[model samples]
Target: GSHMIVQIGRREEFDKKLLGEMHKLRAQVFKERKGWDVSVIDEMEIDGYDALSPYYMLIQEDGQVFGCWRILDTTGPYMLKNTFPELLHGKEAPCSPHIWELSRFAINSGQKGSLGFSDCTLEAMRALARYSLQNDIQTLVTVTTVGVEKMMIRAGLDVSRFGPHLKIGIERAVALRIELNAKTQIALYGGVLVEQR
Candidate 1:
C-alpha cells in the first residue's frame, strides 16, 4: 500500500504503453465483475464523452494502474445527451456554471483486494479537488447505485438521492455530490496542488 503513485490525465496523455492495461482493468471491473456490460475490450475504451471529460489514474510504483475515474464538466460537451441518454430520464437537468459530473470509476483486479487501491483512489480524488480549487469549480457530482452510495458518504460527500431506486445490471445508480475546498484537497490527495505553473 505504501509504494504507490497517483497520476491524473487522459490515458492518451500518460504512458501510452499502459493504455491496454488500463482498458483491460476497466473491462474486468466495470463489465465482467460488476456485470455492467460496458463495451470495453483489451484496448481503448474511448468514447464520445471522453473528449469532454478529464481522466484520473492511480498507479503502482511499478507502473501498473490500480484504479481510474473520470470527471465530466457540465459546461463541457459530455452532457448526458452524448451518451447514456437513459440517465436523462427525458429531462435535461439544470446545468449551472459550477457543477461537474463524476463517472466511470473502476479499480483493477490486481489491486481490488488490497488496501493500496483505496488509498490511491483517495489520492486521485484529492488531486481532482485541487484541480477544482485552482479552476474555481464548486461542486463534484456522480451517479452510483443506492448501495455503493454509502462509499460516497463514507468518503464524506453529500448525497442527493435522485433515482428510480432500481439496480442497473445488478448495480443501482444514484446522484451524489461533494463540496470542494482547500480541506478536500489536503485530506484526499495529501495536499498536492494540481495546478500548472
Candidate 2:
C-alpha cells in the first residue's frame, strides 16, 4: 500500500472520498473505542484543526482506507498547546517549525492488535518518519496515553516523554516526542502533500 499525504495549500488536491473515509475511521477509533472528547456526525469525527489543514497521512487498498495520521506543523494553533496544556507540565508549547504535532491517529479497528501493532501501524511509522525526513521535520510531538507509549516502546520506536502524566478525565495522558531516524526510512512509498475544505 502506498502512503499518501493530503493537505490544503494554494490549491485543492486532497481526495474528498478518502478524507471522508478517514473521518469515519477516526470516529470509529477515537470516539467509539477510545472515548475521547470528540464530536461525531454521520459517523465522522472532525475538529477545528482539520479546518486549518494539517497534513493527513493515509494508507489504502482497493480504495478502502485503513489508517490515517493527522500531522501539523507547530507554527500555528495545536491541540497539545490549546486543548491540553497541562500535559506539558508548564513547559511552553513547542512552536518550532522544525517540530510538529500528531493527533487523531486513526486506525482500522480490525488492524489494532494486542501490545505489538499491525503491519499498517508499522508502515504508518515508516510513512511519518519518511514524510518528516523529506520535509525537514526534526521531531513529532503528541499527547497520548501511557499504554500507547508503552506499546510504541515495545515496537522499538524511539520514544521520549516530555513531562509528567496528568489524569485527564479517567486516563493518564503524557506528552511524547519521536525524533525520526534514518532506519525508519528503509521502507515506504512515495508521497504527495495536501489538506481539506
User: What TM-score goes with each of the models?
Assistant: 0.72, 0.79
Compare the candidates by TM-score and give the number of the best one. Answer: 2
User: On a 0 to 100 scale, what is the lDDT of residue 37 in model 2?
Assistant: 61
Q: How many clashes would you count in candidate 2?
A: 5
List of clashing residue pairs for candidate 2: 6-194, 7-194, 7-195, 8-194, 8-195
Best by lDDT: 2
Evaluate all candidate structures by whole-model CA lDDT and list the values in order.
0.60, 0.71
Residue 8 C-alpha lDDT in model 1: 62
Estimate, for each residue in 70-165, the C-alpha lDDT of model 2 and write its tens digit.
887799988888888878888888998899898887767674332234566776776677667667787889988898788777666668888887
Candidate 1 lDDT tens digits, 33-77: 343336654445645565554664545555566776777777775
What is the Cα-based TM-score of model 1? 0.72
